Amino acid sequence: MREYKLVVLGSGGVGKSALTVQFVQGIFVEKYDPTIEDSYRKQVEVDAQQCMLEILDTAGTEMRDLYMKNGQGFALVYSITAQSTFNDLQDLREQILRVKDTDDVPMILVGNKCDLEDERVVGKEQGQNLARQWNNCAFLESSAKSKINVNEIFYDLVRQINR
């Protein structure tokens, strides 16, 4: 069983923790507890293989360089509710490319909180638009709350890492 070091990144409040905890624990985190740094472990099956995921859940408002050096795959999370969270993702992407010193980094753009369709500031099209600008990146709209596209985030990263 291969080990996969995954890192969830993005600005404060986007639902990095909510997504992770939903994926690993099948629980929806209601309260907002700003994260320092959490690590979770979960065995999954991606493409007929057992994988051990170690998932690092990072602080939004915050050792970043270290995470990027160590991580194999990066979930880049914004909230469709909050425009600045989307804006911030360009720098993270460019930092990761810098630190890893390569274009070819397993990576997914994740538009979270797709259950607050009402409060949606960021559009789905801008989402998908951003991802193509990023070397035909992967893109998902997700909800930690509704359990939509939660697992796919992580499986997609495994696949990419395996490529």
Added chain:
Amino acid sequence: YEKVRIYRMDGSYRSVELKHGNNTTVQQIMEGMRLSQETQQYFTIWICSENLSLQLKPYHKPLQHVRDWPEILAELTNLDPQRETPQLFLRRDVRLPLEVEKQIEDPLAILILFDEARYNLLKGFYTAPDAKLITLASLLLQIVYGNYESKKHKQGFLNEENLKSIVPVTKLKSKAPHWTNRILHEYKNLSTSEGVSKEMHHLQRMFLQNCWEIPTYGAAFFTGQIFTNHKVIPVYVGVNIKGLHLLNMETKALLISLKYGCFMWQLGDTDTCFQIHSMENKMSFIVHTKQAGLVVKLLMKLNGQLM
């Protein structure tokens, strides 16, 4: 700020700000977690290195125990202080009554208790008949692999690789290979059973219910030695809410298991051994360990709790 990692048995952790540096208490650390009171009441902070695990109390300052670890090791054990750096873990409270644990509905509390239970099982700390061990294995298959599929699981699935994640390590070789058919059968039975909720916390709770009957469930383990033409046998001394249990240290074989009210203890004046008198028997034995005092304090406490 200063911060610390609080580990769990599965190797996960959560970072917690130390408001008061190395003066931060267990209490304040428990607060810094993302647990409610419907979670926090079941668990506390332990300090563990490879050969010594201690439950800390609310007023303890854990980082001071990390600091003082070489002196603690030297006081409580005979080990090599160079090999042990301790870490802090969130684990079940050894004082948690079984009756209270049966109350638990909270999914987070269930999975935390579950992860710890699973850890103990795979390490060989739970002694139970093969039937029970097989049930537990089938539940972990459901839990970890999901629904049984004839295609995927019927044959050449449970090699030693897969078996290792579902059976005690102490049985992986001698007994487990013979089990593989009956595990799959109960696994299949679980999957197709519509009377068995496949909700994670429900399946985890079932696993636990099976563990609740195992004599060593929720035991704190200390180390010491017994003497049997006098031969030294290193032992784990397991103290839980049910009583006291001796494991052969090497095989984790269950040597004796005594319920509270069926045995008496006496602390050596030296504080380095204790005697157990097994009433409804002519049985008595003496355990040598520098943990003798902790062991006896804990016996008294957990005996004291029964009503």
